[PDB]
């Protein structure tokens, strides 16, 4: 098994709750939840990861994915205390450490403003978080690898009033779309490129 | 054979323009244009009005739903004259003056305040709209006939700045979701229902 | 309980037959087989005449739909004389002889000359048969009750070279939609219409 | 407005917690929790009884369904006080107690012994929960409302060991397909009917 | 950023157009527009193509797909010149120029003459577009980049008349079902491979 | 065309039918028939293998898949005789022999004991097979090429009475999820990843 995405959320926030809860499958998160997201491979794996982390804490699931290649576990608890023992435990279950992840990589960032109307329609149409309107700013990011994706949402989120579109934090690539007002939005994208610039983690320069 | 409902919407709000190019099967609408719902049974003849309005002016349809009993069809326009125009030459064919519609009925309409965070998990997960957050406060409308939502829908956003979460124009029932601050809402709810209270029509009791 | 459809339709059509090998969720059925379709109420009460004519005949089946209110079975096999002893048994075990059926009523009937491409997109965007173009005609039919559908599209098929775009064969109404030059519409039209109205059955009055 | 059905179920069996688990849309409900299903006209006004009961309990909402004419609301807890206390403040805010529902009403019900290769295949290609196999017992049963099928699934696993195939819980009917031996099938079905048979309501003719 | 594919359509066919429709998501195409694909890495990218695009042109989108890899957008005009236009503004954005993309590649094609009734029931089952009956010959085409799978259908439809019955235009790679006779089957691979083959591009043997 | 997998499954179990039944787009297997599946490279070219396989036996296709990269062709009939004669047809118009497959490889293989009810929610939501209760035992297994999942399947519900849960036999990598006792599991396990260390076939290490 390879550790491919680790993060901890401390805090999650309102509008990524609300976007999880649309298209989770397991058990929701609610406001202000500690999360833990683990993403590996094999795929079909995870759920080893999965077990260790439910025999060991009260977290619950959110999401478990097992996608074309690879596997995403997310864990849940009011406590942060809990959602690192989870991730604890399944580090532990790997024989690995947080930094044998892969580091982050932005393969593509981009603020466009002033989107024309018939590009909201789009977006409108792809996305299962909040709606865009013509005129407003629009941030897109594509990640590698896809398990860090959530956690550029949610720091984004933090920094600044802006709306969760879309977030897809799991695939070959991760992919994250907001949008708000121009300042706001390059807050945003400021904060969420940021947290992924700090996290230790492989060379994965693609 | 009867018409159900009858609105022209003189200008389409931004976010329900975002809710119906999230939707619709047509023609994608776009901000500020005018529209048209019309409402029959049985429901396949909605096509004969389609053609009517087609044939006689430059609209574009948004949505034709022929579902268990009903048909529906919307059709936009920049111009409202041209939109008045569609609108008249599907009375035409169907031999009704726009007072032989259904007088809108409202079957239950309530605000909620301060959302259970379980109550907005509930709403996010059938929602095609905006999300909504825990300690929101939510509008629920219930209409008959159904094609009335969608006046109630533009005018509540005219009125107050609100959130659309939900609204479904088309069945034996319309249904109408909003959620936002609370006195937002309260003047969102006073417009959507004063739209519906002051239209002309057939006696409609339950 | 109630007999509300009952028709045996000779040989299936091709396209008819390609139209069935998309939606149907049982076993395919097979150009030139004979079919049956049986539909009644109460809805779940079709497993009964389904394991009626299972028991009895060489019969595999095609469509077993349990809606909100009814229930509808199709059968078919090779020999025509395999469909018959099929639909005897089920009529059997409901009680029934054919006659008892509901006598299908013509809703709706319409033919609409030179689509123009705004409806042309409509009826693409909601069928399930072939395609159609803008500037050819369509024909759209609807039935109570709504099992008397197919038999409309099978002997439509029969007399003319259309296009099936759509059957709907179950609901609250049954429902058509074809496809073609103005000629071969017209043809098509009257044939389907003519099968309806020589069926006997009880008054089935709106 | 109209209570349609109330049943407390003390304690959920496996099989019906997986079920639940699969088709839900809220928060999952877990082996022996307690549950409230509350079904009621109309539609659109569940949220006010769903409201009610998370102000005033602990309990998860599993299902909120607004479908054509009806609402569900189905609230789960560790206790079934809490599952109590929550039915009891969705009664108040109707204004009803439990026995202004409408008693249950069977429409049909009927085991199918040794099903046929080609039945157990249509079965299996509908449901949501297990799966059946040639030569098994089949039991079916249609109710009147939609909202007691799940008090009827539950009690049917109590009694035997059968195989839960597919409960519908909302709608104009509801339904229940169970599978396994015929004497485990035959007890299951007395536990099923004797449940729906002792319980108070309004009287329910057809 | 990667150019991958890029191809003007001069005018669009009626069948592709109804296939487009029933697909696209966003800005429906109508017969005999000019339509231009490009097909880029990374995958969200392409949303600032969509963006240069617009700004520069009155084109409106029909697809713009975010696929596991790569992104595609299809803008189209009723005139040439805007769509030209429009495709200058993309190639402009990437640095590039048309040769820049990859010459397409034919992985896999062959005509099956006289289908089985089985295959057709399959194809049938897939396809979004015509359906297709026993005995009738396919045409089946890969190509890879994706991207050239709409031309390689628009080239078909004008030399033959064939039915278009799948095509899929993004992904790893591209692919084309046609049925029809044998002779235009035969006429319209011919004219499909061979406007593939006279594209400029960077080898691309695989 | 590459020959990534090819089995022959002597006789259909009947949970794997019940499955198949559940997921298959084409004709359906019945309990105990003789199946061959063939998965090849490139996609579309499985079509070349129907064809030949369906004019030289009387075999019936369940599933026909073409996927992002791969094809899979599943044939079954009541006479292993016909199922190898149209596995031998197919491998002729490879110009391939079986041993020409690539070897299966197990990716992953674990088993769970004791699962906790958490997770036994999520490969409910997930599953098309059997539903799992909490403190079941799990088995998961990914192997490569996808193809051999089937015949993994097969093979183990013959050596132990398991639930089969999921298999997904085409992909980048084929996936298997059994549930059931921790004793028969261990068989089943056995005797599946044994079917797989026998088979013939080039070297496919990763």
Same mark, same amino acid.
């Given at each position: 098994?390879?550790? @491919? ?17 649309? $298209? ?41 994915? $097992?996608?074309?290649?690879? +596997? ?32 982050? @990589? ?60 879309? $977030? $897809? ?5 991760? @992919?994250?779309?907001?949008?708000? +007002? ?15 610039? +700090?996290?230790? +983690? ?5």
């Amino acid at each position: 098994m390879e550790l @491919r995405a680790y993060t901890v959320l401390d805090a999650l926030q309102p509008q990524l709750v609300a976007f999880l809860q649309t $298209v989770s499958t397991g058990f929701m998160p609610m406001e202000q939840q500690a999360s833990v997201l683990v993403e590996i491979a094999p795929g079909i794996a995870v759920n080893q990861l999965t077990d260790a982390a439910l025999k060991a804490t009260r977290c619950q699931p959110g999401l478990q994915i $097992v996608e074309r290649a690879y +596997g995403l576990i997310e864990m849940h608890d009011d406590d942060q205390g809990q959602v690192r023992a989870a991730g604890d435990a399944m580090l532990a279950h790997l024989g690995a450490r947080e930094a044998d992840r892969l580091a982050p @990589r932005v393969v593509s960032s981009q603020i466009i403003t002033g989107i024309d109307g018939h590009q909201s329609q789009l977006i409108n149409r792809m996305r299962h978080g909040d709606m865009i309107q013509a005129g407003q700013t629009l941030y897109i990011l594509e990640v590698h690898p896809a398990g860090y994706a959530a956690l550029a949402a949610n720091e984004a989120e933090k920094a600044a009033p802006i709306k969760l579109l879309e $977030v $897809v934090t799991f695939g070959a690539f991760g @992919r994250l779309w907001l949008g708000g +007002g121009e300042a706001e939005i390059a807050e945003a994208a400021r904060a969420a490129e940021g947290a992924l610039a +700090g996290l230790s +983690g492989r060379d994965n320069r693609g």
